[PDB]
Design an enzyme around this catalytic site. Structure first.
Site, PDB file in Angstrom:
ATOM      1  N   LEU C  37       1.073  -1.105   0.159  1.00 27.31           N
ATOM      2  CA  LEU C  37       0.268  -0.058   0.253  1.00 27.31           C
ATOM      3  C   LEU C  37       1.192   0.980   0.113  1.00 27.31           C
ATOM      4  O   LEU C  37       2.221   1.262   0.483  1.00 27.31           O
ATOM      5  CB  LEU C  37      -0.544   0.102   0.932  1.00 27.31           C
ATOM      6  CG  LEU C  37      -2.200   1.028   0.483  1.00 27.31           C
ATOM      7  CD1 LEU C  37      -3.500   0.345  -0.475  1.00 27.31           C
ATOM      8  CD2 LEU C  37      -3.404   0.000   2.083  1.00 27.31           C
ATOM      9  N   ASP C  38       0.145   2.466  -0.523  1.00 29.98           N
ATOM     10  CA  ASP C  38       1.178   3.452  -0.133  1.00 29.98           C
ATOM     11  C   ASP C  38       0.362   4.613   0.780  1.00 29.98           C
ATOM     12  O   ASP C  38      -0.824   4.014   1.471  1.00 29.98           O
ATOM     13  CB  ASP C  38       1.260   4.057  -1.576  1.00 29.98           C
ATOM     14  CG  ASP C  38       2.483   5.347  -1.730  1.00 29.98           C
ATOM     15  OD1 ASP C  38       2.574   5.628  -1.286  1.00 29.98           O
ATOM     16  OD2 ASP C  38       2.301   5.252  -3.023  1.00 29.98           O
ATOM     17  N   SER C  39       1.017   5.572   0.871  1.00 28.51           N
ATOM     18  CA  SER C  39       0.323   6.762   1.828  1.00 28.51           C
ATOM     19  C   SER C  39      -1.410   7.707   1.844  1.00 28.51           C
ATOM     20  O   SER C  39      -1.700   7.206   2.530  1.00 28.51           O
ATOM     21  CB  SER C  39       1.766   8.125   2.226  1.00 28.51           C
ATOM     22  OG  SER C  39       2.729   7.586   2.833  1.00 28.51           O
TER      23      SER C  39
END
Ligand SMILES: Nc1nc2c(ncn2[C@@H]2O[C@H](COP(=O)(O)O)[C@@H](O)[C@H]2O)c(=O)[nH]1
Ligand SMILES: Nc1nc2c(ncn2[C@@H]2O[C@H](COP(=O)(O)O)[C@@H](O)[C@H]2O)c(=O)[nH]1
Ligand SMILES: Nc1nc2c(ncn2[C@@H]2O[C@H](COP(=O)(O)O)[C@@H](O)[C@H]2O)c(=O)[nH]1
Ligand SMILES: Nc1nc2c(ncn2[C@@H]2O[C@H](COP(=O)(O)O)[C@@H](O)[C@H]2O)c(=O)[nH]1
Ligand SMILES: Nc1nc2c(ncn2[C@@H]2O[C@H](COP(=O)(O)O)[C@@H](O)[C@H]2O)c(=O)[nH]1
Ligand SMILES: Nc1ncnc2c1ncn2[C@@H]1O[C@H](COP(=O)(O)O)[C@@H](O)[C@H]1O
Ligand SMILES: Nc1ncnc2c1ncn2[C@@H]1O[C@H](COP(=O)(O)O)[C@@H](O)[C@H]1O
Ligand SMILES: Nc1ncnc2c1ncn2[C@@H]1O[C@H](COP(=O)(O)O)[C@@H](O)[C@H]1O
Ligand SMILES: Nc1ncnc2c1ncn2[C@@H]1O[C@H](COP(=O)(O)O)[C@@H](O)[C@H]1O
Ligand SMILES: Nc1ncnc2c1ncn2[C@@H]1O[C@H](COP(=O)(O)O)[C@@H](O)[C@H]1O
Ligand SMILES: CC(C)(COP(=O)(O)O)[C@@H](O)C(=O)NCCC(=O)NCCS
Ligand SMILES: Nc1ccn([C@@H]2O[C@H](COP(=O)(O)O)[C@@H](O)[C@H]2O)c(=O)n1
Ligand SMILES: Nc1ccn([C@@H]2O[C@H](COP(=O)(O)O)[C@@H](O)[C@H]2O)c(=O)n1
Ligand SMILES: Nc1ccn([C@@H]2O[C@H](COP(=O)(O)O)[C@@H](O)[C@H]2O)c(=O)n1
Ligand SMILES: Nc1ccn([C@@H]2O[C@H](COP(=O)(O)O)[C@@H](O)[C@H]2O)c(=O)n1
Ligand SMILES: Nc1ccn([C@@H]2O[C@H](COP(=O)(O)O)[C@@H](O)[C@H]2O)c(=O)n1
Ligand SMILES: Nc1ccn([C@@H]2O[C@H](COP(=O)(O)O)[C@@H](O)[C@H]2O)c(=O)n1
Ligand SMILES: Nc1ccn([C@@H]2O[C@H](COP(=O)(O)O)[C@@H](O)[C@H]2O)c(=O)n1
Ligand SMILES: Nc1ccn([C@@H]2O[C@H](COP(=O)(O)O)[C@@H](O)[C@H]2O)c(=O)n1
Ligand SMILES: Nc1ccn([C@@H]2O[C@H](COP(=O)(O)O)[C@@H](O)[C@H]2O)c(=O)n1
Ligand SMILES: Nc1ccn([C@@H]2O[C@H](COP(=O)(O)O)[C@@H](O)[C@H]2O)c(=O)n1
Ligand SMILES: Nc1ccn([C@@H]2O[C@H](COP(=O)(O)O)[C@@H](O)[C@H]2O)c(=O)n1
Ligand SMILES: O=c1ccn([C@@H]2O[C@H](COP(=O)(O)O)[C@@H](O)[C@H]2O)c(=O)[nH]1
Ligand SMILES: O=c1ccn([C@@H]2O[C@H](COP(=O)(O)O)[C@@H](O)[C@H]2O)c(=O)[nH]1
Ligand SMILES: O=c1ccn([C@@H]2O[C@H](COP(=O)(O)O)[C@@H](O)[C@H]2O)c(=O)[nH]1
Ligand SMILES: O=c1ccn([C@@H]2O[C@H](COP(=O)(O)O)[C@@H](O)[C@H]2O)c(=O)[nH]1
Ligand SMILES: O=c1ccn([C@@H]2O[C@H](COP(=O)(O)O)[C@@H](O)[C@H]2O)c(=O)[nH]1
Ligand SMILES: O=c1ccn([C@@H]2O[C@H](COP(=O)(O)O)[C@@H](O)[C@H]2O)c(=O)[nH]1
Ligand SMILES: O=c1ccn([C@@H]2O[C@H](COP(=O)(O)O)[C@@H](O)[C@H]2O)c(=O)[nH]1
Ligand SMILES: [Mg+2]
Lengths: 103, 217, 79, 111, 69, 115, 87
Positions: C37-39
């Site tokens: 996942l990313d921010s």
């Protein structure tokens, strides 16, 4: 040189030497006119020879505020002198037909 | 007191009843919107509706460089070099598409026509569009700022070095040389400023105009 | 308001969501290395929740979800 | 009246692949609404602008000016002017190169 | 690296919170156009460009230069 | 106005618009029954040995009263089909282009500023 | 010059009854303060519409609906009307 340089363009002919002196691996303009090492942009090569030959021009540039005159390196006189050295033979023996020699 | 130039009739063989009929339509329009005292050095923000859009208003700010046009079609031209590019709009004063005109800085320059600012540097003609109007004083003299401009090199739009223009708003000395100071002084023509019948003596005419102005209120 | 109603509804809209996979989807799924996942992609998990259930989720408590066990347990007491 | 609400009724009737309607500020002066829509082919764009003139001719707007369709020789861009909105038809390739959505939403903050 | 690391999270969430009430412009393309503005442009850039790109979306939050209806 | 071989400037974000060396495009034709070209007239333009259609957006010539009289003859570039070359326009453009006949809705969607 | 020329089809936009003004569209042959000949138009489309015009002359002694200071057209802007808004 079989046609006058006016109908074609001096800077139009100037870039075509850079096509035929860089893609043919015949970098033979860098011992007479060695600028830094070698370049392929027609803007940069007409810059440094105009410094070496001391070329000045006074051109009406057209900015949005009005017509002002800016002293510039003489790009047609740089395109002239870069074409004469080609015809004198002080730039290297080149074949212009390597594009049709491919195959 | 300040009488605006367009109410003065130009010298001519026009019947004075023409300018009396003109001044009636001048003064009925002035009831709609307020026209302030704005000079040739004044900075103005003019809001106009226009038929090109869907009925919005356009606010154009500028220096009122030239305020000729003598009649009901009186004009004033504004300058801005916003985003590095010169914009030049000739605003008709009595056209009914204006809503309100206001002064940002009510001041006057040394010259009666600031047409030389085309040939001046753009730094002496740019103006902040979202800038606030300056605080005005009620009863003092109008400010004259001696802000004699510097120009671009010699191929100007017009020969401002000639004395027929009588420009007093240039620092001439550092941009122009002394031999072509002398050659421009060859066109000095000193007899004009000493003359009598090329001087339109207009002192008596303002008495009838100011009689017309205050009797309309 | 059943606790197991949270289990089959919140995971259901994640099952329709195509970036995550059933392969690594446990009850204690890590979000950096076990989910990838990313921010701002953590916000996309929240916006997969807020459109269907909720409508009062704050900002600082939406950062530390971190695992599918907490998103049932924290939002159980939200009701 | 030929307003914004029936544009959604008209564009989604022919299954438009993209609809982008922008309320411009009253300070900035072109129009009131800016419609940017896309299409499947250049044929789908050309009949689409030729039907949105079909509704206006029968809805009335008697005192309003008529409608000229601009771009009848090009394929990648079709635009129709009106008094309170201006519609603009492109291809999904032509959508990205002009980035026309961010121009009227960010007037001087873009590439 | 940005002006604030949490401000990137808030500006993403606020612009989608302005986007759930979209009714004329398509909600499907609006969410994708939000992503392609941020996945491509906010991964690896220079120092001052980080401050400029986040301040770009603050103006888009206010809608003072145009709102998408 | 703009006759044949005036020097104009191209106001575009094109790669063809930021010309080095001979940085002054020269027109060869005006698309009117006169030689005179006004705001919203097609002209040709010779740029870098390439002849290109163009559109006059404001000139240095005094026209009607409440229209801007730009201090540079600035001209936007279009091809034969009618859409502009560039993606952005940063110069001011007058709003007199909407009423006038021609493919001018293509141009006004590119202008960032309307003065 | 100094010959009798006629301009054709010039609209009256306004009339000042007090000072006896005809407000004629465009330019009239002759210099300022010169005598003219003011006839209804010869143009076929503009010469038949004469129903509402007072036919022998206009008589102020009729004393029915005395005309104001200034009679206007439909399209003109009144000096005293506010700023025109196109929306
Ligand atoms: N000249 C021309 N007319 C067209 C073209 N396509 C459609 N039309 C015309 O436009 C009409 C549609 O417009 P109405 O105003 O609805 C058609 O009936 C047809 O006559 C075209 O490519 N060229
Ligand atoms: N009165 C008058 N104005 C003229 C004449 N020629 C030009 N003008 C003015 O100059 C403007 C520009 O003329 P060009 O021919 O485009 C005209 O619109 C008009 O205002 C003329 O013979 N008489
Ligand atoms: N191109 C063009 N437009 C015309 C013509 N006749 C009228 N128009 C348009 O219609 C408008 C109204 O003209 P009516 O004849 O009042 C004009 O101002 C013009 O825009 C014509 O022959 N050619
Ligand atoms: N109103 C008007 N009449 C003109 C104009 N040019 C010529 N005429 C009319 O035509 C007559 C003959 O002109 P020729 O150019 O010889 C003139 O005396 C005048 O009546 C013009 O520009 N405007
Ligand atoms: N407004 C206008 N009237 C003209 C022009 N040329 C001629 N005229 C008209 O023609 C008359 C001259 O008649 P002939 O040219 O003899 C003028 O007095 C004027 O009424 C022109 O360019 N503009
Ligand atoms: N701005 C102006 N508007 C109208 N007439 C002007 C004018 N400037 C000069 N004139 C008139 O034009 C004639 C010639 O002026 P020129 O500058 O020599 C004179 O009669 C003069 O009064
Ligand atoms: N031939 C012409 N064409 C257009 N406008 C004119 C004109 N002659 C005069 N005007 C208008 O009238 C103003 C001056 O009024 P008059 O000529 O004193 C000008 O500044 C201009 O606005
Ligand atoms: N006979 C002619 N008369 C006028 N202009 C001509 C012309 N032939 C060509 N031109 C001009 O030269 C341009 C280039 O034409 P070329 O044949 O591609 C034309 O668009 C037109 O502007
Ligand atoms: N009534 C008319 N008849 C013929 N040609 C006309 C015309 N009106 C305009 N034109 C043409 O259009 C050109 C531009 O005129 P416009 O009014 O600025 C004219 O020089 C002429 O070639
Ligand atoms: N006979 C004609 N031929 C061509 N265009 C005409 C025309 N009469 C009017 N127009 C167009 O309409 C414009 C003016 O609108 P209307 O006629 O007030 C003109 O600038 C021109 O573009
Ligand atoms: C910093 C980081 C790698 C953090 O990701 P992790 O994984 O949690 C990622 O969120 C990021 O790249 N943010 C960039 C913020 C920014 O300054 N954007 C403007 C660039 S012009
Ligand atoms: N005795 C006169 C008569 C007219 N005039 C004005 O001068 C104008 C033209 O002459 P200039 O001042 O050069 C006339 O149209 C009139 O307005 C004048 O200055 N002195
Ligand atoms: N006779 C005239 C008078 C003005 N004009 C135009 O109107 C503008 C305003 O002039 P006024 O006389 O202030 C001029 O700069 C010129 O462009 C014209 O073309 N012909
Ligand atoms: N190009 C055109 C357009 C309309 N018309 C006429 O005008 C009528 C109204 O067309 P509008 O596009 O609604 C047509 O039915 C036809 O009689 C025409 O003759 N030529
Ligand atoms: N040649 C033409 C073109 C249009 N028109 C008028 O213009 C209207 C719109 O036509 P456009 O081509 O859409 C028509 O309905 C008709 O009234 C015309 O009378 N003759
Ligand atoms: N003869 C004509 C041609 C066009 N027009 C107008 O111009 C519009 C566009 O016509 P073009 O030929 O595409 C028409 O819909 C109509 O409004 C007209 O009124 N009369
Ligand atoms: N038989 C005629 C009639 C009129 N005319 C000219 O036409 C002008 C206008 O005449 P109307 O009838 O108003 C006259 O002043 C004269 O110049 C003429 O020369 N011969
Ligand atoms: N060449 C011209 C142009 C206009 N005019 C007059 O000026 C009036 C206004 O014309 P403008 O171009 O709008 C015309 O109706 C006509 O009376 C003229 O007499 N000769
Ligand atoms: N070249 C011309 C000649 C006359 N005119 C107009 O025509 C009127 C009458 O001129 P005649 O040549 O008498 C003038 O007062 C002027 O308004 C013009 O505008 N341009
Ligand atoms: N070419 C012309 C001729 C006259 N005029 C103006 O038209 C009006 C009437 O002039 P006539 O020639 O009488 C005057 O205001 C004059 O200055 C003009 O502006 N341009
Ligand atoms: N002096 C004139 C000029 C035109 N006409 C006619 O009036 C009609 C329209 O005038 P012009 O072409 O605008 C035409 O039929 C023309 O022949 C006339 O009867 N007398
Ligand atoms: N030399 C002539 C002779 C007759 N006419 C007549 O005058 C009419 C004027 O018509 P308008 O252009 O509407 C013509 O149709 C013709 O009957 C003319 O215009 N010119
Ligand atoms: O009589 C005419 C002819 C063309 N035009 C305009 O010119 C445009 C191009 O016409 P052409 O004949 O291709 C047309 O679509 C109209 O906008 C008129 O307004 N009136
Ligand atoms: O082959 C041609 C093309 C144009 N022309 C003329 O040029 C005018 C403008 O043509 P363009 O292609 O817009 C046209 O109306 C004719 O007067 C010719 O005489 N012959
Ligand atoms: O009403 C007009 C205007 C121009 N023309 C023609 O156009 C030529 C140029 O006029 P423009 O308006 O510059 C003119 O010399 C005439 O040949 C007309 O025939 N009628
Ligand atoms: O005072 C005059 C006399 C003739 N003319 C013109 O000259 C033409 C020939 O006349 P002459 O001057 O003989 C005549 O037909 C008129 O067009 C004038 O314009 N003014
Ligand atoms: O160029 C022109 C313009 C108008 N006129 C005359 O002026 C009258 C009014 O024209 P305007 O443009 O409304 C017109 O019907 C003609 O009689 C000319 O003679 N020549
Ligand atoms: O530009 C113009 C305008 C009118 N006229 C003449 O004036 C007459 C009346 O025109 P008006 O615009 O009603 C017209 O029929 C022509 O004879 C011209 O010659 N040229
Ligand atoms: O040179 C002339 C002679 C008559 N006429 C017109 O013709 C009318 C009478 O001539 P007929 O033959 O009915 C007259 O009243 C004018 O309208 C002209 O316009 N010019
Ligand atoms: Mg000059």
């Amino acid at each position: 040189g079989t046609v006058l340089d006016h109908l074609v363009g001096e800077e139009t002919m100037a870039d075509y030497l850079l096509y035929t002196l860089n893609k043919h691996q015949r970098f033979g303009y860098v011992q007479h006119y060695g600028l830094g090492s070698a370049c392929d942009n027609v803007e940069r090569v007409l810059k440094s020879v105009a410094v070496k030959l001391g070329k000045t021009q006074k051109v009406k540039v057209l900015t949005g505020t009005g017509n002002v005159n800016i002293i510039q390196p003489n790009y047609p006189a740089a395109a002239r002198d870069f074409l004469q050295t080609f015809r004198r033979g002080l730039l290297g023996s080149v074949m212009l037909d390597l594009d049709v020699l491919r195959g | 007191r300040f009488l605006s130039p367009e109410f003065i009739p130009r010298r001519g063989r026009t019947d004075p009843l023409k300018f009396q009929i003109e001044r009636k339509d001048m003064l009925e329009r002035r009831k709609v919107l307020h026209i302030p005292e704005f000079y040739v050095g004044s900075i103005l923000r003019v809001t106009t509706a226009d038929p090109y859009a869907s009925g919005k208003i356009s606010q154009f700010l500028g220096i009122c460089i030239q305020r000729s046009g003598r009649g009901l079609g009186a004009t004033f031209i504004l300058r801005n070099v916003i985003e590095g590019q010169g914009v030049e709009i000739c605003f008709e004063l009595y056209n009914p598409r204006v809503q309100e005109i206001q002064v940002v800085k009510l001041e006057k320059r040394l010259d009666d026509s600031l047409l030389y600012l085309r040939d001046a540097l753009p730094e002496y003609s740019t103006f902040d569009v979202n800038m606030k109007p300056v605080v005005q004083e009620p009863n003092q003299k109008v400010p004259v700022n001696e802000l004699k401009v510097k120009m671009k090199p010699k191929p100007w739009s017009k020969r401002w070095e000639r004395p027929n223009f009588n420009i007093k708003g240039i620092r001439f000395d550092l941009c122009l040389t002394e031999q072509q100071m002398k050659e421009a002084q060859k066109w000095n023509q000193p007899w004009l400023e000493f003359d009598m019948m090329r001087e339109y003596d207009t002192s008596k005419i303002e008495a009838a105009i100011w009689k017309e102005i205050e009797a309309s209120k | 308001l059943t606790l197991e109603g949270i289990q089959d509804r919140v995971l259901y809209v994640l099952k329709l969501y195509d970036k995550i996979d059933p392969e690594k989807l446990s009850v204690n799924s890590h979000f950096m290395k076990d989910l990838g996942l990313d921010s701002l992609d953590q916000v996309e998990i929240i916006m997969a929740m807020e459109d269907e259930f909720g409508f009062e989720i704050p900002d600082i408590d939406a950062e530390k979800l971190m695992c599918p066990q907490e998103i049932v347990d924290y939002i159980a007491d939200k009701k | 009246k030929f307003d914004i609400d029936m544009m959604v009724s008209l564009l989604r009737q022919e299954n438009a692949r993209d609809i982008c309607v922008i309320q411009v500020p009253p300070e900035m002066r072109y129009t009131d609404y800016f419609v940017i829509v896309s299409g499947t082919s250049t044929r789908h764009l050309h009949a689409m602008a030729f039907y949105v003139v079909k509704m206006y001719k029968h809805l009335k707007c008697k005192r309003d000016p008529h409608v000229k369709i601009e771009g009848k020789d090009t394929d990648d861009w079709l635009c129709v002017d009106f008094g309170s909105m201006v519609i603009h038809l492109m291809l999904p390739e032509t959508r990205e190169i002009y980035e026309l959505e961010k121009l009227w939403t960010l007037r001087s903050y873009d590439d | 690296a940005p002006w604030s690391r949490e401000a990137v999270l808030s500006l993403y969430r606020a612009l989608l919170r302005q986007g759930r009430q979209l009714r004329y412009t398509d909600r499907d393309f609006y969410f994708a156009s939000i992503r392609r503005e941020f996945r491509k442009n906010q991964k690896l850039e220079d120092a001052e460009a980080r401050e400029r790109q986040l301040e770009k979306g603050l103006v888009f939050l206010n809608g003072k230069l145009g709102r998408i209806i | 106005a703009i006759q044949k071989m005036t020097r104009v400037r191209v106001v575009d974000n094109s790669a063809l618009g930021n010309s080095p060396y001979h940085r002054a495009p020269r027109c060869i034709h005006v698309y009117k029954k006169n030689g005179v070209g006004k705001v919203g007239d097609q002209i040709l333009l010779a740029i870098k040995g390439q002849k290109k259609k163009a559109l006059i957006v404001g000139h240095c010539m005094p026209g009607p009263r409440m229209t801007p009289r730009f201090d540079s003859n600035n001209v936007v570039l279009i091809e034969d089909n009618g859409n502009p070359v560039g993606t952005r326009i940063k110069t001011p453009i007058p709003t007199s282009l909407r009423k006038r006949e021609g493919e001018y809705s293509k141009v006004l969607a590119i202008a960032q500023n309307f003065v | 010059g100094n010959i009798y020329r006629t301009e054709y089809g010039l609209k009256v936009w306004r009339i000042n009854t007090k000072h006896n003004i005809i407000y004629v569209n465009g330019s009239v042959p002759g210099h300022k303060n010169c005598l003219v000949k003011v006839k209804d138009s010869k143009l076929p489309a503009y010469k038949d519409l004469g129903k509402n015009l007072p036919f022998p002359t206009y008589f102020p002694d009729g004393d029915e609906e005395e005309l104001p200071e200034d009679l206007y057209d439909e399209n003109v802007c009144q000096p005293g009307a506010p700023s025109i808004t196109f929306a």
